[PDB]
Amino acid sequence: APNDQHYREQWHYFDRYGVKADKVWDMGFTGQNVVVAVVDTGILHHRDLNANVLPGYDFISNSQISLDGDGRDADPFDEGDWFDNWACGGRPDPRKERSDSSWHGSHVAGTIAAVTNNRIGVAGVAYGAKVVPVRALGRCGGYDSDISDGLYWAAGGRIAGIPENRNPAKVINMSLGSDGQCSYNAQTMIDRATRLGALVVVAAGNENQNASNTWPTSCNNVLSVGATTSRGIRASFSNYGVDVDLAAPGQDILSTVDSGTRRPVSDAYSFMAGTSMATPHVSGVAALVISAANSVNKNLTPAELKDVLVSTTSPFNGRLDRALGSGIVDAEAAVNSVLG
Ligand SMILES: [Ca+2]
Ligand SMILES: [Ca+2]
Ligand SMILES: [Ca+2]
């Protein structure tokens, strides 16, 4: 087990309905040399992230969303997506009036590869991997076109005006989405990333609805992740249905954030719930699998990697109320599969 101060609270890594990441670490696989891209709100300069974070890129085109004074730029720092006075619409709905900064991209990034065995804070599923933050979300979310350009760059695609990605990712985590069908542009970029070799791992969404009514789940060539609880059943908010590929822990997920309600104040750790939290468990396990496959000289296409993940899942706790993919992602079974 790692020495991290709050590892024991990360039930989702090691306990009954967790992802069995600990069993893979025991085999000596940690996602070594694998790059995972995180298309999200950007990254904090958090002491429990910095060593496992590579420089990424900020794809937010509108400065009113980016809150950093300009359009696309080389610094994917999460400025904080806080707002007040219904800046993101919906006035006068009391639930939409204001929000603290989410630090969503950092919570997600920490699940994949928080710095581990460094005494402080938490652990990451693939703590030998490196994360490339692709900032596409800010105040009020992000543009579909910024998300799709970012995911393409994440895979190794060239975007005019932006440097070539030196560290294209084998796994692209997208803990994001909204109502509606996959756009032509989103589908096209997902297909291009898939043809580069990247597995695009996406959140099923959080409206207790059919995930097929949302994107990116409704896209071809994605692996859609539903959310389960520490009791092994469907989290109440999790989207569901035939297009959910599998599930992962998505309620009371402890990871890396900032204590600041607006701007960054201090490195912190919080519990969050969402398919956004389940997704990076699957992205992390994918990176563990690739490190294992690398060791035996085995290539996995995105379709093959998805099939490894989906066919090796562990069972739910009795009957669920909805289709939620094949079971809970299981790193031990997935890695054992590719090692032969
Ligand atoms: Ca900017
Ligand atoms: Ca920036
Ligand atoms: Ca740590």
Residue numbers in the entry: 2 to 341
Publication excerpt:
Sequence analysis of the aprV2 and aprB2 genes has shown there is only one amino acid difference (Y92R) between the two mature proteases. To investigate how the single amino acid difference (Y92R) between the active forms of AprV2 and AprB2 alters the substrate specificity of AprB2 we determined the crystal structures of AprV2 and AprB2 to 2.0 Å and 1.7 Å, respectively. The two structures were very similar (RMSD of 0.28 Å for 339 Cα) and therefore we will describe the structure with reference to AprV2. Surprisingly, the single amino acid difference between AprV2 and AprB2 (Y92R) is located at the tip of this extended loop, ∼27 Å from the active site serine (S277). Purified AprB2, which differs in sequence from AprV2 only at residue 92, is less efficient at degrading elastin. Under these conditions, the ability of AprB2 to degrade the substrate was significantly less than AprV2 (p<0.05). Both proteases displayed similar activity against the soluble chromogenic elastase substrate, N-Methoxysuccinyl-Ala-Ala-Pro-Val p-nitroanilide (AAPVn), with kinetic parameters that were of the same order of magnitude. Instead, the reduced elastinolytic activity of AprB2 is likely to arise from impaired enzyme-substrate interactions at a site distal to the active site. To our surprise, complementation of the aprV2 mutant with aprB2 also restored a virulent phenotype, indicating that AprV2-mediated elastase activity was not required for virulence. Importantly, the hoof digestion pattern produced by AprB2 was similar to that produced by AprV2, which is consistent with results of the virulence trials.
Dichelobacter nodosus is a Gram negative, anaerobic rod that is the principal causative agent of ovine footrot, a debilitating disease of the hoof of ruminants. In strains that cause virulent footrot these proteases are called acidic protease isoenzymes 2 and 5 from virulent strains (AprV2 and AprV5) and basic protease from virulent strains (BprV). All of these proteases are synthesised as inactive precursors with an N-terminal pre-pro-region, a serine protease domain and a C-terminal domain of unknown function. AprV2 adopts a subtilisin-like fold consisting of a curved six-stranded parallel beta sheet sandwiched between two and five alpha helices.
